């Protein structure tokens, strides 16, 4: 049968999701996370629909900005694979940890 060698579907997905503007986390399991991170500050809080979509445009902008920084840490160590050494380095240099 036909078979792509490993590294060619991964590059067309980098080309795919850098062309779009969609939200990459599903909508409903992200609303259920927000509603339980906010339940230990006040009980029975309510949310606008544009207040949860404001949190998701910010969390995906934070993580995509983190994975650009964590990719330059793996290239710097002569790898191409990300591993959580690289995340923990990029968190430290930006003053987050």
């Amino acid at each position: 049968p036909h078979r792509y060698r490993p590294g060619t579907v991964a590059l067309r997905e980098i080309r795919r999701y850098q062309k779009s503007t969609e939200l990459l986390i599903r909508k409903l399991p992200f609303q259920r996370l927000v509603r339980e991170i906010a339940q230990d500050f006040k009980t029975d809080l309510r949310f606008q629909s544009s207040a949860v979509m404001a949190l998701q445009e910010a969390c995906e902008a934070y993580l995509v900005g983190l994975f650009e920084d964590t990719n330059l840490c793996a290239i710097h160590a002569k790898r191409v694979t990300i591993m959580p050494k690289d995340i923990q380095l990029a968190r430290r240099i930006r003053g987050e940890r």
Binding site: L55, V64, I82, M83, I87
Partner: protein, 79 residues
Amino acid sequence: RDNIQGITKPAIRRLARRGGVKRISGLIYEETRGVLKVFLENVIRDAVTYTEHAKRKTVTAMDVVYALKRQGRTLYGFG
């Protein structure tokens, strides 16, 4: 609980694709959803203390936007 698991392995993997990531080690998917929830615990606890100050019960869209701006993470498109 069990809601942090809803940010799935292919959802983190395609956020990594927008950042340019070629291949992901398997111990990242429990790493980033720990990084994500630390981020939301800082934005929401400033969002919901804007709702207490305004004596509201709902979290408006401006309360997320004002909470993000004071972390140096300003957002355009919601007010």
